[PDB]
Automatic annotation (TrEMBL), chain B:
Protein name in the entry: PilP
Lineage of the species this protein comes from: Bacteria, Pseudomonadati, Myxococcota, Myxococcia, Myxococcales
Residues forming coiled coils: none
Residues of the full protein shown: 59 to 115 of 172
Automatic annotation (TrEMBL), chain C:
Keyword list, A-Z: Membrane, Transmembrane, Transmembrane helix
Species: Myxococcus xanthus (strain DK1622)
GO biological process entries: type IV pilus assembly; type IV pilus-dependent motility
The gene coding this protein: pilN
Name of the molecule in the record: PilN
Keyword ATP-binding: no
Highest taxon of the lineage: Bacteria
């Protein structure tokens, strides 16, 4: 869904953390898609890339 | 929890292969003969080579 | 219930752990040492950690 920013290769420094098993790189993008008279989503489409642990 | 145990068990063996394919599909490539007894060489419909000899299947 | 991983090389140990708070990790870190580290060398084990290729 080329709503999305691209990429999947970088070098990461931690700001905050909650899962000791997950290193999320960043919320790569997010756009609230409203829809039209034919129907809704209204939600916030988004994209994330994350290197796990192991 | 199953990927983080990064585990692979590679393929290199026989699949037990030719006993899963029909005999008229197999093609004789070559034959070797010497002191180690005569051995035939045969080709799969999947294009693998095999080596088989008297008493084998 | 503790600390997680231990891995040595007969000169240094690179451990991996978990503690109760800013206190027991402070007790543990005090029980050892405290150092101003300077010129670090990058080695192929670091990237094997970035690769996930050495399980940690």
């Amino acid at each position: 869904v080329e709503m999305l920013t691209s990429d999947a290769t970088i070098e990461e420094f931690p700001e905050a953390q909650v899962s000791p098993f997950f290193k999320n790189i960043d919320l790569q993008t997010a756009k609230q898609v409203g829809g039209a008279q034919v129907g809704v989503p209204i939600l916030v489409e988004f994209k994330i890339t994350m290197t796990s642990n192991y | 929890d199953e990927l983080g145990p990064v585990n692979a068990n590679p393929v290199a063996a026989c699949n037990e292969p030719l006993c899963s394919f029909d005999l008229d599909q197999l093609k004789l490539v070559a034959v070797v003969t010497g002191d180690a007894s005569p051995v035939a060489m045969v080709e799969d419909p999947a294009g693998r080579g095999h080596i088989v000899r008297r008493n084998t299947r | 219930v503790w600390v997680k991983t231990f891995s040595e090389n007969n000169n240094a140990v690179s451990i991996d752990g978990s503690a109760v708070s800013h206190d027991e990790v402070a007790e543990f870190m005090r029980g050892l040492n405290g150092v101003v580290w300077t010129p670090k060398g990058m080695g192929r084990l670091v990237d094997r950690r970035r690769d996930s290729k050495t399980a940690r």
